[model samples]
Target: GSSGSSGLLARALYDNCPDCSDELAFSRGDILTILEQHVPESEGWWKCLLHGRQGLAPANRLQILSGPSSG
Candidate 1:
């Protein structure tokens, strides 16, 4: 069976350790595979999974992979 994909791929910027455990911390330029995304009440916020744990990271702080923009 083929499953559909929802979110795009991304990478982390600064250290995003909102918790004390190592499961939440992501170093700059680290790979963060998103498990789920958040529909924001405010802009520039995305909830994702990283380092085997899920948490919130700034959308601006991460580099997202997307298709080419139309000129």
Candidate 2:
């Protein structure tokens, strides 16, 4: 059965820290909800939510999880 659409989920491949003030910091194996695929101002960065906090995370550092896919 089809479920309601939701944001993409990704797992952190490595620990990441904010270089600037607008970025998000997370540890490895952390689950993040992708809010946006890419940032217009920055390349290879994605907006994600973790532990009720929202910030930008490096796209390459995250592994997109295949959710409810057809086999």
Per-residue CA lDDT of model 2 for 8-64, tens digit only, reads 788999999787657888999899888877568778887888876688888889898
Q: Model 1: which residue pairs collide? A: none
Task: Give TM per candidate.
Answer: 0.58, 0.76
- Per lDDT, the best of the predicted structures is 2
Error of 2 at 68 (Å): 5.5
lDDT of each: 0.62, 0.81
> How many steric clashes does model 2 contain?
0
Q: Assess candidate 1 and give its lDDT.
A: 0.62
Error of 2 at 54 (Å): 1.3
How well does candidate 1 match the true structure in TM-score terms? 0.58
Candidate 2 regions with alpha-carbon error over 4 angstroms: 1-6, 68-71
lDDT of 1 at 68: 82
Query: How many residue pairs clash (N, CA or C atoms closer than 3 angstroms) in each of the candidate models, in the order given?
Result: 0, 0
Clashing pairs in 2: none
Worst 10 residues of 1 by lDDT: 34-43
* RMSD in order of candidates: 4.8, 4.0
